[PDB]
């Protein structure tokens, strides 16, 4: 396992994409035998399915995947927060938001909003729960994520111990980081994080990447 | 002529000390035959003997000196200024100041401030002239910095052609910076600058520095 660490972005609406995205990512650190990825997240939500999908590619990848809230403004909010919850360690950068959870379900004529029905909302309420529970998170917070449609700022999200590391950037992530151990396992083995001699490399999105983030 | 950049932090007021950093930082990554180094720098001023000494030490480098007014809300002010200008390449993050180069000599009584003599004050403006036009940057700004207490938006710095990259972080200085051509040579060659598949290293400060760091 090199000392070598990734840097991706992901931005905007989470779509099908945006898990080519994820696994895209993951995998070239996976094959080059990475230390940690870091993803640099922004979204407001988006598609249930390819969150589910990303949460799965996450749990089973080979190295730590670090959720980090980014830039400043930036927001892991709906969809964004399982993203979060599910990964091997949160950092949220300075005037970043988690939370905001409460499904609707579309829109309803001239001007209105759908609430979801009790029974799929039980499922995401549990579903959240259980990411929470797996990894060490306020499961009782990450619940009201949802029934209180509940936002938090950075320093609520360490202190109800939701998130792990406040960051203001990609250095300060990798000194605050260092020797702290995974809130879920890799490939079987609970990994302690070791960013010390550590190298970066950033990568960058494709052309496509560009295109369809215009498009959506 | 690896390709793998070093970043480190230069923050407070100039001192003796301050060139001791400054000389560390560029010497490791002398040593390890770099591409380039980003001193991310926050300075108000310091001693004018120092930033001279420092201006020599990034002059007759090895390898390719980026400053980078870095972070948002820092500032390169008076002696900050000239380490700056005689950089191989200036980036300021948004939010950032360059300038406020007017030197007075002291502070006078109870509540005052001194004013220097015109044969002083001749001296920095035309240091600062040359430090512009060796760089191939505005020289006529420069001079402001002194004349007119003048100070910059990062914004306005780039379009007056007093620095060459605005950027948020490390992984957009990168990006925005290859295949960048130096301002200023590196031991004797003009240097252009390729960060494709560049490894980035972050040098922290030392437990001596934070001490002196809290004294001055």
Redesign the interface.
């Known amino acids: 396992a090199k000392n ?1 660490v990734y ?1 991706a972005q992901i931005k905007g609406q989470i779509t099908s994409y945006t898990y080519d995205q994820f696994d895209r990512y993951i995998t070239i650190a996976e094959q080059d035998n990475a230390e940690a990825i870091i993803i640099e997240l922004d979204t407001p939500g988006g598609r249930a399915d390819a969150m589910m999908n990303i949460v799965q590619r996450i749990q089973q990848s080979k190295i730590p995947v670090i959720i980090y809230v980014y ?1 400043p403004g930036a927001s892991a909010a709906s969809a964004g927060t399982y993203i979060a919850l599910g990964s091997h360690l949160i950092a949220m950068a300075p005037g970043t938001s988690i939370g905001a959870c409460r499904p609707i379900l579309g829109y309803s004529q001239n001007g209105s909003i759908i609430e979801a029905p009790p029974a799929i909302t039980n499922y995401f309420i549990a579903y959240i729960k259980s990411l929470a529970q797996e990894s060490g998170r306020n499961a009782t917070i990450a619940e009201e994520f949802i029934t209180k449609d509940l936002s938090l700022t950075p320093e609520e999200a360490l202190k109800y111990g939701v998130i792990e590391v406040v960051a ?4 300060e992530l ?2 605050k980081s260092n020797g702290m151990k995974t809130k879920i396992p890799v490939n079987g083995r609970y990994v302690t994080l070791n960013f010390t ?6 990568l ?1 999105p494709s052309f496509k990447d560009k295109l369809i983030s215009y498009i959506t």
């Open positions: 070598i840097v830039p203001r950037d990609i250095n990798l000194k001699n550590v190298e970066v490399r950033y960058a």
